[PDB]
Design a protein around this ligand. Structure first.
Ligand SMILES: Nc1nc2c(ncn2[C@@H]2O[C@H](COP(=O)(O)OP(=O)(O)NP(=O)(O)O)[C@@H](O)[C@H]2O)c(=O)[nH]1
Ligand SMILES: [Mg+2]
Length: 166
């Protein structure tokens, strides 16, 4: 079947793993558990197409930058994740996108900007700034909560559709 190689990147603790576990295992981890490098493979049906999501869950820690570069050269689509209560994770978004552009030798690779933890009451990133940044990249912005599952399918399925239209 068709396989979509997806890569989830972003600063430490924004909820990269929580989003993937919500998508694949239908629950929210709610635990401290830093990632080195995890892969998830799940057969799905998206818009009638039987396909395999091959999801690389990456580390936000700086020491694993080189491992990221190598391991995400095969990515067809990228979720670039920040948390809505972490202004520095939003500031870091541009750095992950630029790293993706250099490893993919491309400036329009399928990508979704994901603003996670929208269930929280303590917002520090303004929605308007995220929409404006997404529009300056030419990519969708999707707000998510790995806790409530809001937007989770939307984020991953939208990325697959970006890949289809590339
Ligand atoms: N309230 C809330 N907490 C969340 C959400 N997503 C993740 N968290 C919490 O935020 C923390 C970090 O989540 P995690 O998924 O491990 O983040 P990560 O980006 O994968 N970290 P790393 O880069 O180290 O692998 C955990 O305590 C997790 O339960 C969310 O949508 N809402
Ligand atoms: Mg993780």
């Amino acid at each position: 079947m068709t396989e979509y190689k997806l890569v989830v990147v972003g600063a430490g603790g924004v909820g990269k793993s929580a989003l993937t576990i919500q998508l694949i295992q239908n629950h929210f981890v709610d635990e401290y558990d830093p990632t080195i490098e995890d892969s998830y493979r799940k057969q799905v049906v998206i818009d009638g197409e039987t396909c395999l999501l091959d999801i690389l869950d990456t580390a936000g820690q700086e020491e694993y930058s080189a491992m990221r570069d190598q391991y995400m050269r095969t990515g067809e689509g990228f979720l670039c994740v920040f948390a809505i209560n972490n202004s520095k994770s939003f500031a870091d978004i541009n750095l992950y996108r630029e790293q993706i552009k250099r490893v993919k030798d491309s400036d329009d690779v399928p990508m979704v900007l994901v603003g996670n933890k929208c269930d929280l009451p303590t917002r520090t990133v303004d929605t308007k700034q995220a929409h404006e940044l997404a529009k300056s990249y030419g990519i969708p912005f999707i707000e998510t909560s790995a806790k409530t599952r809001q937007g989770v399918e939307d984020a991953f399925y939208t990325l697959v559709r970006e890949i289809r239209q590339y």
